[PDB]
Amino acid sequence: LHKEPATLIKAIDGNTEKLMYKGQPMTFRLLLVDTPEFNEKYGPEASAFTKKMVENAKKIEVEFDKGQRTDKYGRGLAYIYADGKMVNEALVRQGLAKVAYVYKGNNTHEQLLRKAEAQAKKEKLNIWS
Numbered sequence: 001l002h003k004e005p006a007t008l009i010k011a012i013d014g015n016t017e018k019l020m021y022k023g024q025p026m027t028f029r030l031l032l033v034d035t036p037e038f039n040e041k042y043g044p045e046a047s048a049f050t051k052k053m054v055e056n057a058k059k060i061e062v063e064f065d066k067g068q069r070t071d072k073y074g075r076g077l078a079y080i081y082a083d084g085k086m087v088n089e090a091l092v093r094q095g096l097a098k099v100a101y102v103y104k105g106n107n108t109h110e111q112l113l114r115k116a117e118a119q120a121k122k123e124k125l126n127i128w129s
C-alpha cells in the first residue's frame with residue numbers, strides 16, 4: 001500500500017472526514033472501524049478525538065487498500081494518517097472504535113487493528129470500560 005497526500009477540509013466525526021484528495025473534495029469513510037454515533041455513548045468523545053488528531057496534524061495522508069476505493073454512498077474508503085499516525089488504529093487503540101466492516105480484499109491492516117482492540121479491551125478503555 002501507498003500513502004498519498006490530502007488536506008483536511010472539515011472534520012465530521014469518528015467514522016468520516018471531508019478531505020481534499022487529488023484536488024477534489026471527498027468524504028472519507030475510515031476502513032475497518034466503527035465508532036459510536038454522536039447520540040451514542042462515547043460518540044462525542046470519538047468525534048472530538050478524531051477532530052483533534054486531524055486538525056492538529058501538519059500532514060494528512062490517505063492510504064487505499066487493494067479493493068474497492070469508494071463505497072455505495074460515494075465515500076472514499078481508506079486508512080487516514082495524521083503526521084504518520086493512523087487515525088483508524090488510534091481510535092481502536094483508545095477504545096473509541098471497534099474493528100468492524102472487515103471485507104475480503106480491503107483488509108490489509110485487520111490484524112494490526114485487532115491487536116489495538118485487544119490492548120484497549122485489556123486496559124478497559126472507554127467503550128471497553
Ligand SMILES: Cc1cn([C@H]2C[C@H](OP(=O)(O)O)[C@@H](COP(=O)(O)O)O2)c(=O)[nH]c1=O
Nearest residue numbers: 015029030031032033034071072077101103
Ligand atoms: C466501512 C465500510 C462501510 N460500508 C458501508 C456498509 C454500511 O452499509 P449500510 O449504510 O447499508 O449500513 C455502511 C455503514 O457505514 P457507517 O458506519 O458510516 O453508517 O457503510 C462499506 O460498504 N464498506 C466499508 O468498508
